[PDB]
Amino acid sequence: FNITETYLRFLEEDTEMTMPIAAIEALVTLLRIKTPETAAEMINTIKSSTEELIKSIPNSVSLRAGCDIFMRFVLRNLHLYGDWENCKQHLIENGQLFVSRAKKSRNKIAEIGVDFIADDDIILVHGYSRAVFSLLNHAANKFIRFRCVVTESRPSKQGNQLYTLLEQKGIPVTLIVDSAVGAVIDKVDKVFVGAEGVAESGGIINLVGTYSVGVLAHNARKPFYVVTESHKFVRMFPLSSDDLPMAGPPLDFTRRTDDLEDALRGPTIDYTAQEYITALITDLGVLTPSAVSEELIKMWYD
């Protein structure tokens, strides 16, 4: 029936259906066909489909995290030894209810996380997450004064994409390069970030230059922010500064070339430690330091 193909169908869609929430909705559809009455036939085939999904993954982390929460909810269903049928109907229904919860959470955060941006504050924003930009838009809806500084992130050129999406709103902007990002931290009140994942330790899984931002801000004593939707938690503990799950290059040094083809190769995803984050924002209240681990301990019961 396929799950990778269902995820590939979301091309011109996105924005509303968040990348993990669309993968979770795809997991529920695959579950509801071949009877969730059996726990040997279904769960094993769900595990095989997640393994097939991980094997097809090039540079995504959040899809593995979202699977875990689904699994957890499924197991928790019939924890009351309830009827093998009303528990099943509640499990199938919690697929569309899971996607509907992404809207309700965004409604919560955009009213909570506008408080952090005070009267007339210049912001240097890095990365693009649907939660952080929704704060930025619904603060403009709240009629609050804020300036914006764009970071030239280099994955699939994200800075230019961010700049254009800020133009459509009506907020004054200018391009700042990630090389010169050190020379900006004096005319900037606060530094904001959108994460691809949040660590078990309390650190962050992010883009092509975020640790560098974290350290410079720690030097300048200027605050460093992480805002996300509460589903990007993996049981992952990157022990060192340069160790992450990869399908491509972990720093490759190429031979002598004349035509110039083999060059680009650098760490596209980088980790930053727990100390560098001043504040973290999700729908699960306002919490930063040891909070992430407590969430993971509560979920995994281990």
């Binding site: 009351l80 001043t278 504040a279 509560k298 979920m299």
Partner: protein
Amino acid sequence: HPNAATSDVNVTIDTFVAKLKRRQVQGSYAIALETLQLLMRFISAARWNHVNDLIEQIRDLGNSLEKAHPTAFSCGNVIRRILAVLRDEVEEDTMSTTVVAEPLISSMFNLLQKPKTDYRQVAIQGIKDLIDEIKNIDEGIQQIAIDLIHDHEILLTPTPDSKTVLKFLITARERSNRTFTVLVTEGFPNNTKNAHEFAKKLAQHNIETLVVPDSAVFALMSRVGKVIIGTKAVFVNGGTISSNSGVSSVCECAREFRTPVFAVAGLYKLSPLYPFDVEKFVEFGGSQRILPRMDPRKRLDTVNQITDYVPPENIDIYITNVGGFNPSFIYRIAWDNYKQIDVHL
């Protein structure tokens, strides 16, 4: 909801409102006691028969109380504390009226799995326990705190205003095995009088007293063993609002010299609210106490603030009646006493 229903039956609402606005009431400890006696009067006098209508009414009363006075966090916390004590006993009561409820631990995750009696008596006793808790904090501090400070160590102290910290210091000086030198920053525009009384009570007990001007803090930081904070209110992220003047700079001075920072507080003093901005939370002082003559005050726009904020980056321990906790853990102590809904009243 307005105070139109509670006027002849309850009069003490408006006298507390008057005590806050004109600042007739002083010190978070006292504000808490008054709100306790308010909720004592609310349950003893009112007639409700229904439970959910009652709780939401209490929520609106607390909402109006915090809007009446923003620096009364001890007011806001005490109500929130009883609210949660109520909510647990209601959830226990609903399980018996309907008829695993014990998975592993006492967690959170309210986004995952879905859902006549002596309840009023429990509400009464719940207030009584809160009073007794506020009555005795020092006993719970001294057993954790007087284990960390050594002989021949010099202690620098901003905020001499706290009754809690001074009494912690006197119990340690009572121990003849422990010797320490006390440096006290003055805190000129506000703390001065309190700092002088602090220096008097240390001499009364015969402890090596050293009065320090707010300029000289740097000129001593090489010699300082430890730093102690007399905080008013503690927060989610760890940070504190303290009882006025000359703390933030001292903490900045300590961190640069890598000198340890201590904080003495209570759980009622601890708040489940988040300080997203210091700009809103901090209260500003009266510039009258700085400079005389009003014709030069046209051109002399002087800045003075009472309450001082410390970010969590500096302090390391919050010794309470329960125990010593790190700022990266204090949120859990808070959630153990106040619920997630009981924040936005």
